[PDB]
Nucleic acid binder design. Structure first.
Ligand SMILES: Nc1ncnc2c1ncn2[C@@H]1O[C@H](COP(=O)(O)OP(=O)(O)NP(=O)(O)O)[C@@H](O)[C@H]1O
Ligand SMILES: Nc1ncnc2c1ncn2[C@@H]1O[C@H](COP(=O)(O)OP(=O)(O)NP(=O)(O)O)[C@@H](O)[C@H]1O
Ligand SMILES: Nc1ncnc2c1ncn2[C@@H]1O[C@H](COP(=O)(O)OP(=O)(O)NP(=O)(O)O)[C@@H](O)[C@H]1O
Ligand SMILES: Nc1ncnc2c1ncn2[C@@H]1O[C@H](COP(=O)(O)OP(=O)(O)NP(=O)(O)O)[C@@H](O)[C@H]1O
Ligand SMILES: [Mg+2]
Ligand SMILES: [Mg+2]
Ligand SMILES: [Zn+2]
Ligand SMILES: [Zn+2]
Lengths: 635, 635
DNA sequence: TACTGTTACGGCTCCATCAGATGGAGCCGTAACAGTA
DNA sequence: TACTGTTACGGCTCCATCAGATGGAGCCGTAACAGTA
């Protein structure tokens, strides 16, 4: 009736002991970097998978793969578990919806077993693969096959029906089975990934979902919550790590981590129901949910100064030749149901034309007639909706670009000048100044065949990634290993008189990563930490006073405090005289915008029109828009 | 704390509900054919494996394979399970001890990871593979490697040490790692199979062992029981299906099935401790253990009549050029520790020479000088230690040889003579008289890719395996489908006036298979049922009054009642004037023998000498023999 | 002449056993070119 | 002359993703040959 964990010390967990109720809807909350993933996916799921795998033969074990042994003492009440990872999965161009959701395999099995020589219900394999999800489901629900075929193909038909029912329930009935998985939107790809693993329900199985609401509108999130509630009612346990308020409100139990991030978190601050979390002063999530701490809606919203960006004849993808006016110099939020065509408009027309017109880029934009009002802009800065790549040869210092300046100033010292060194000597990714016994890695990763990998630190350089010859040159009493060793606050104090480094380090501090180390590997970063690193990298660039910031969903992996900090940064940028355009599903970011352009009313072929246009108060007066309904509810 | 099963109806289970204690030594007893395997390996293990597999992806599922869904309602308290099947596994000549026990893989991993360029402890891969188990274990326990190598290769060394420790504990220290697995004795192969799956212990794992004591002496069984007790004390649950008295006496809980076999069993008769089972009148196992029912030791043992079989210079395999005298006309039991060389003597010299001398066979015997006393014999009948092959095209009627006579008498009828039919028309394995829609199978087995197979009965012949044209000819009002449909008692009454069929059917009844059907598939037979079918096939042959019966472990898969029946049959054969020689580890069979030849004192290179020779009472006076010690204990 | 052993020969079925590679995409470091200030 | 965009190019690393085959052994059915009784 419980999953009891004792002595969990993985990553930054501070020897925490927790009890998780079984056959319930449990939600794990906390700040970005608290340790929710290290507790759910890296301890419980890892222990369950290892326990299941250890009972199999070596031949099967070397195919399935063994996870790393978690640093835990005793876990009880486990069971078979299915986990959905937080990180998004890229797709090859060949993979389609049917291939990804494992529907084509069942289709081939059915056609091979009860096929009529290649005719089940009066259709062939291509005629049934090239249909929308809703009509394919209604076709498969009206299959008049014989009794022998019914007995033979019971399981295949049941699996197909369950998968199609889930895909219809989430709201993806407009897609077909032949649509390429690599061209779907963020929310559609997230829902397809969810349906791949959770479409066919089981019994007595723990489901661990790490942020299952990427690029999902509130309406889509409600349908996903209904499906999750049905799956839990099927006799299962659900462990969902989320930052969404609706997910917490729709859960039986809440486990709150914190109280901070990195080395200041890894603990348990509060637990109980939603009201219990709200009443706990030590819980930051409860403080933000109870209204004690909140993002303040402006009393007066900025008005356009007469300069507008007019997009005429926008017909890219599913856009139905619409005209959109984006005011300049204010904060504008682009809203719509997942798949309605907000990314395909903004990121594929506005940014792709602004870059060519201003930054002298060579990227072909989408299908549009013309854009007017470009002359009121100087440069464009964009943040994509795609995640960042993770390599052990990467860290926040290299990603943001300050490591180049640090290496240059290290190579400009007196001793380095005497020895004839350059900036390439002070990097652990170039031969000449790095330890060759570890190739600048610092630690050695030994990979076994079927056993979990073992990490052993290097002994020649003691994990410093550099040899003594390169470590013999120091700047202000510190060598480059100590430079990579200090955190962002220490580096901010260290380089306070160097504007070039100080600007980017101050940006990193302002996005909320002062605790992080300059040399922490990208592979060991968190989702929110990587998102904020990308945000700081893009926002650390120089602003000319009349510049456009285009952000495509910068809320992913961010707690309420993090989005509050980002909102403050964006509002300061707006007050500086720049124009900020944000494609956002987060309603807290939306409620502070001075202008809203809403698209819909549906996704795919059912959307692409400007349902609403104006200030949030005016949009809330429109009953057609779901965004308007939610805005009216929360205003 | 329990494994609760409800509504189990697999095979012949009569909707039984049981509760199995956890972290205990549980033994399941009952008659041959009661349903112990169908309850342990076909319900609990099947459900656990299916539940674990269903949580994985299709790619891994179609590699691991899905077991058939058991006919059960609700099973709780499950966990990862490791099962050892009752049926023995044949081995290719290429496989060795290290390959089978998964020790070579760990050896290669260690040599690749901490090798010194190919030198770990001062030895190479061949110099360490070509050693006995004890010296290899003592070498690996004295490895003076460096600290970095110690940290790197901790798990590999731990696994190797645990496997070698188990192999030494069971008593196989005289074997090597390069020894071919296909040339081992029955007990040695059984112990190697056990060590493959149970050598490295785990925690919180259910172990299901189906008859883990094939070809094991009492001394070897004691060591195996000690190892099993240690493994259970490591925090595990053990479910052992056994007929051995020592295994029941060394278990915390006993679950008894019955009260019979086939359609007369499948229930639960009693449960509790050993004393509780003994005190239950409805429990046949308790009745045999408590002494109410027993095999009666003869008051006076038959003496040799002056005719002996002298084997001079027996040096085959591990035999040390020994001389053995086997009295003729009495019951002689060959006893010894597993590997001492009883099979290599008897089956490889005595039978292989008697067959050539009497049955005009062309099989080359082993290494011996000569055998004297052959002229007092007319024919030899042998039962091998190997199990029988299982095919769906097989049944007891075809195996024993009565189906040929039945087909001949069916083809000799008036209507068959008029139509010009032959015996080949009345068989479901020859084209012409069988249904071609199922190829004489009766049912169709549809195999999926990763889903469990589905069985659908044929519709053209309704599962009768024959068409209407072949079913239109009947003998005594019954067609051949009804002939295959009746049980052995019905066929015994049916063919009471036909001596040829009646002899074999009476033999089948006498071995205890009167309930079984003539047409039951061999693949669906039980281990004890197959053993008794082979015994009846070999014992149904004509006896000339002076003939030698050689039986190599005919007790496998047989309860105490079955071995009592077999002992009675063998004693009747002896009283008929024939000579019976039985290689037996069962002490109840041994105590009734009129002569005993004991070999030992150890296995492999440590045995091959006649430790004792004489009547069981005289052998019990020798302290050298473990067999003598047990005989003294039980006499 | 029939019962009882052996052998071969064709067809059918069960079981052991082995121990990832290739294409796609992102990131670091370096160089080159161009527009402003 | 310096700060800030773009592009290319080499090297390194992470991730998706596909959808068993072959040799060995036992058994049924049939035929042929031989030793007795
Ligand atoms: N190897 C490591 N050693 C120590 N700390 C680590 C290591 N890897 C990650 N961390 C830190 O451990 C903290 C928790 O990581 P993680 O559990 O992934 O965060 P999270 O709670 O899921 N955050 P988010 O996904 O953004 O909501 C973060 O501050 C990481 O930077
Ligand atoms: N390359 C493409 N070819 C065809 N259709 C596409 C392509 N890319 C996207 N679409 C479709 O265009 C519609 C709008 O997608 P897009 O504009 O990217 O989504 P969005 O509204 O921003 N929603 P989301 O990203 O989930 O928050 C969806 O139905 C997509 O499936
Ligand atoms: N498909 C089937 N349908 C009905 N009965 C079956 C089937 N398969 C096997 N049986 C019978 O079910 C009974 C129990 O089988 P099984 O569980 O294998 O026996 P067991 O208890 O392990 N006996 P043994 O191994 O000799 O000690 C036997 O009489 C089988 O002949
Ligand atoms: N072909 C072979 N070549 C070499 N050694 C062999 C061979 N067959 C058996 N041995 C060994 O000879 C010894 C005696 O084996 P064997 O006589 O078959 O055993 P047994 O005494 O009858 N015991 P068991 O069959 O387990 O009850 C063992 O050490 C075997 O490993
Ligand atoms: Mg996370
Ligand atoms: Mg059995
Ligand atoms: Zn090093
Ligand atoms: Zn048929």
């Amino acid at each position: 009736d419980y999953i009891v964990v004792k002595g969990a010390r993985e990553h930054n967990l501070k020897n925490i002991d927790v009890k998780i109720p079984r056959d319930k809807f449990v939600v794990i909350t906390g700040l970005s970097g608290s340790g929710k993933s290290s507790l759910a996916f890296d301890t419980i799921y890892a222990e369950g998978q290892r326990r299941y795998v250890e009972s199999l033969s070596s031949y099967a074990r070397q195919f399935l793969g063994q996870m790393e042994k978690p640093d835990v003492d005793y876990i009880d009440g486990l069971s078979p578990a299915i986990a959905i990872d937080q990180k998004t999965t890229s797709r090859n161009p060949r993979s389609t919806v049917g291939t990804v959701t494992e529907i084509y395999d069942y289709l081939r099995l059915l056609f091979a077993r009860i096929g009529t020589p290649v005719t089940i219900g009066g259709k062939n394999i291509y005629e049934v693969c090239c249909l929308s999800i809703g009509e394919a489901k209604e076709f498969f629900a009206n299959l008049n096959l014989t009794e022998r075929q019914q007995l033979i193909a019971r399981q295949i038909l049941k699996e197909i029906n369950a998968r199609l029912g889930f895909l219809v329930d989430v709201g993806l009935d407009y897609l077909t089975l032949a649509r390429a998985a690599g061209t779907l939107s963020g929310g559609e790809a997230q829902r397809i990934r969810l349906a791949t693993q959770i479409g066919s329900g089981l019994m007595g199985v723990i489901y661990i979902l790490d942020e299952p609401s990427i690029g999902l509108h509130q309406r889509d999130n409600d349908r996903l919550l209904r499906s999750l509630k049905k799956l839990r009612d099927l006799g299962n346990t659900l462990l969902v790590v989320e930052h969404d308020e609706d997910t917490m409100y729709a859960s039986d139990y809440i486990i709150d981590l914190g109280p901070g991030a990195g080395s200041h978190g890894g603990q348990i601050v509060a637990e109980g129901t939603v009201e219990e979390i709200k009443q706990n002063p030590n819980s930051v999530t409860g403080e933000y949910l109870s209204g004690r701490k909140k993002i303040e809606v402006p009393k007066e919203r900025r008005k356009p100064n007469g300069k507008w960006l007019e997009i005429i004849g926008a017909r890219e993808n599913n856009l139905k030749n619409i005209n959109v006016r984006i005011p300049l110099g204010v904060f504008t939020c682009i809203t719509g149901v997942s798949g309605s065509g907000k990314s395909s408009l903004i990121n594929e027309i506005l940014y792709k034309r602004l870059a060519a017109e201003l930054n002298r880029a060579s990227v072909k934009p989408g299908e549009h007639d013309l854009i007017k009002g470009i002359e009121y802009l100087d440069k464009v800065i964009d943040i994509d909706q795609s995640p960042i790549g993770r390599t052990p040869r990467s860290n926040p210092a290299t990603y943001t670009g300050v490591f180049d300046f640090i290496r240059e100033i290290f190579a400009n010292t007196t001793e380095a000048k005497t020895r004839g060194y350059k900036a390439g000597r002070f990097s652990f990714n170039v031969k000449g100044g790095r330890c060759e016994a570890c190739a600048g890695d610092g630690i050695n990763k030994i990979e076994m065949h079927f056993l979990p990998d073992i990490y052993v630190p290097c002994e020649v350089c003691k994990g410093k990634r550099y040899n003594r010859e390169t470590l013999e040159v120091r700047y202000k009493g510190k060598n480059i290993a100590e430079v990579l060793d200090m955190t962002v606050e220490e580096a901010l104090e260290f380089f306070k008189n160097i504007p070039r480094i100080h600007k980017k380090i101050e940006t990193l501090y302002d996005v909320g990563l002062g605790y992080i180390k300059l040399g922490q590997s990208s592979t060991t970063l968190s989702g929110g930490e990587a998102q904020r690193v990308k945000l700081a990298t893009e926002l650390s660039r120089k602003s000319t006073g009349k510049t456009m910031y285009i952000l495509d969903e910068p809320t992913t992996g961010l707690h309420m405090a993090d989005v509050h900090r980002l909102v403050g940064i964006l509002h300061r940028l707006v007050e500086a005289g720049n124009s900020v355009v944000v494609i956002e599903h987060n309603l807290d970011v939306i409620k502070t915008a001075d202008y809203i352009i809403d698209l819909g009313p549906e996704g795919g072929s059912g959307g692409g029109l400007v349902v609403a246009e104006g200030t949030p108060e005016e949009v809330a007066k429109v009953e057609n828009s779901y965004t308007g309904q939610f805005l009216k509810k929360v205003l």
